[PDB]
Design an enzyme around this catalytic site. Sequence first.
Site, PDB file in Angstrom:
ATOM      1  N   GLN A 118      -5.486  -0.111  11.154  1.00  0.00           N
ATOM      2  CA  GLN A 118      -6.293  -0.352   9.973  1.00  0.00           C
ATOM      3  C   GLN A 118      -6.523  -1.845   9.783  1.00  0.00           C
ATOM      4  O   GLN A 118      -7.453  -2.228   9.068  1.00  0.00           O
ATOM      5  CB  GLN A 118      -5.652   0.155   8.687  1.00  0.00           C
ATOM      6  CG  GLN A 118      -4.300  -0.421   8.424  1.00  0.00           C
ATOM      7  CD  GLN A 118      -3.607   0.305   7.309  1.00  0.00           C
ATOM      8  OE1 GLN A 118      -3.132   1.429   7.480  1.00  0.00           O
ATOM      9  NE2 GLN A 118      -3.590  -0.314   6.133  1.00  0.00           N
ATOM     10  N   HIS A 169       2.052   3.725   0.877  1.00  0.00           N
ATOM     11  CA  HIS A 169       1.319   3.771   2.134  1.00  0.00           C
ATOM     12  C   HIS A 169       0.894   5.197   2.403  1.00  0.00           C
ATOM     13  O   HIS A 169       1.695   6.121   2.253  1.00  0.00           O
ATOM     14  CB  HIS A 169       2.191   3.228   3.277  1.00  0.00           C
ATOM     15  CG  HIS A 169       1.460   3.038   4.568  1.00  0.00           C
ATOM     16  ND1 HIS A 169       0.371   2.196   4.699  1.00  0.00           N
ATOM     17  CD2 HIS A 169       1.681   3.569   5.798  1.00  0.00           C
ATOM     18  CE1 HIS A 169      -0.062   2.240   5.949  1.00  0.00           C
ATOM     19  NE2 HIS A 169       0.708   3.070   6.634  1.00  0.00           N
ATOM     20  N   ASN A 213       0.617   7.096  12.029  1.00  0.00           N
ATOM     21  CA  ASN A 213       0.333   5.905  11.252  1.00  0.00           C
ATOM     22  C   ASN A 213      -0.979   5.276  11.710  1.00  0.00           C
ATOM     23  O   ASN A 213      -1.569   5.675  12.713  1.00  0.00           O
ATOM     24  CB  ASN A 213       1.502   4.929  11.376  1.00  0.00           C
ATOM     25  CG  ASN A 213       1.584   3.972  10.206  1.00  0.00           C
ATOM     26  OD1 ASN A 213       0.789   4.073   9.265  1.00  0.00           O
ATOM     27  ND2 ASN A 213       2.597   3.092  10.211  1.00  0.00           N
ATOM     28  N   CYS A 250      -5.449   2.360   4.428  1.00  0.00           N
ATOM     29  CA  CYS A 250      -4.621   3.468   4.887  1.00  0.00           C
ATOM     30  C   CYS A 250      -5.052   4.786   4.258  1.00  0.00           C
ATOM     31  O   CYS A 250      -5.047   5.826   4.925  1.00  0.00           O
ATOM     32  CB  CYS A 250      -3.136   3.173   4.626  1.00  0.00           C
ATOM     33  SG  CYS A 250      -2.687   2.879   2.898  1.00  0.00           S
TER      34      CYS A 250
HETATM   35  C1  E6C Z   1      -2.118   1.487   1.906  1.00  0.00           C
HETATM   36  C2  E6C Z   1      -2.041   0.688   3.222  1.00  0.00           C
HETATM   37  O1  E6C Z   1      -0.907   0.594   3.740  1.00  0.00           O
HETATM   38  O2  E6C Z   1      -3.113   0.215   3.650  1.00  0.00           O
HETATM   39  C3  E6C Z   1      -2.927   0.869   0.754  1.00  0.00           C
HETATM   40  O3  E6C Z   1      -2.387  -0.327   0.256  1.00  0.00           O
HETATM   41  C4  E6C Z   1      -3.050   1.959  -0.322  1.00  0.00           C
HETATM   42  O4  E6C Z   1      -4.114   2.511  -0.540  1.00  0.00           O
HETATM   43  N1  E6C Z   1      -1.951   2.341  -1.001  1.00  0.00           N
HETATM   44  C5  E6C Z   1      -2.065   3.379  -2.002  1.00  0.00           C
HETATM   45  C6  E6C Z   1      -0.923   4.402  -1.909  1.00  0.00           C
HETATM   46  C7  E6C Z   1      -1.046   5.607  -2.856  1.00  0.00           C
HETATM   47  C8  E6C Z   1      -2.199   6.502  -2.418  1.00  0.00           C
HETATM   48  C9  E6C Z   1       0.248   6.409  -2.969  1.00  0.00           C
HETATM   49  C10 E6C Z   1      -2.127   2.759  -3.405  1.00  0.00           C
HETATM   50  O5  E6C Z   1      -1.322   1.913  -3.764  1.00  0.00           O
HETATM   51  N2  E6C Z   1      -3.129   3.214  -4.174  1.00  0.00           N
HETATM   52  C11 E6C Z   1      -3.386   2.768  -5.530  1.00  0.00           C
HETATM   53  C12 E6C Z   1      -4.604   1.858  -5.575  1.00  0.00           C
HETATM   54  C13 E6C Z   1      -4.288   0.420  -6.004  1.00  0.00           C
HETATM   55  C14 E6C Z   1      -3.412  -0.347  -5.002  1.00  0.00           C
HETATM   56  C15 E6C Z   1      -3.679   0.397  -7.406  1.00  0.00           C
END
Ligand code: E6C
Length: 212
Positions: free
Chosen positions: A19, A159, A175, A25
Amino acid sequence: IPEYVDWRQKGAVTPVKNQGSCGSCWAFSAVVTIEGIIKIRTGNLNEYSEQELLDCDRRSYGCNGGYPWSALQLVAQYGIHYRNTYPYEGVQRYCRSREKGPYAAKTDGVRQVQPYNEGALLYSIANQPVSVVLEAAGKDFQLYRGGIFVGPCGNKVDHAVAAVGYGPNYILIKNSWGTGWGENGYIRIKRGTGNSYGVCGLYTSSFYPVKN
Ligand SMILES: *[C@@H](C(=O)O)[C@H](O)C(=O)N[C@@H](CC(C)C)C(=O)NCCC(C)C
């Protein structure tokens, strides 16, 4: 359900992706589940566009994170292009679905697995790849190089990944940190430890596309 499920063996998993530095992700996770369900239902294994969900899922925040639920919901609402037609750039850009022609695939909805329930997750995976979240911020997880991963890790899921199989003592995770990480891009996370969250909170929030 069988003791072992591996969607890679059944031809339902596309090569592992990276990514990059973009927090896409959620879209990578969502895309694995879409590619999976299209293979299962059509027989054809195609790569679908993470970039398209990154650009077009307006519940999510592009490179600042997002939700595998909402991305799955978008593909059930509108559809998704082939990765070839809407290739990954690792930056959120303006949404180009319409400008790329008819969608290449479409699903019929999104179901959530009952959370904090190992069995229900395993029953979904037995049926198709599932989008799951977990705690990836620990060094142990970042530095994982193989084996059944048992932590240490908390349950602060941050993540999104895709569960593409399982076995008696693990769940097999795809992943999106390229081939050079984990077990050729995969991790096997311990299951069956009695923790309702699951190792690294793996049972926190799990979704999957529905296709009739
Ligand atoms: C994940 C990555 O590792 O690229 C990316 O940071 C992400 O989308 N994480 C989300 C995880 C949830 C789906 C559990 C996340 O934090 N989503 C919330 C959106 C904002 C960061 C508030």
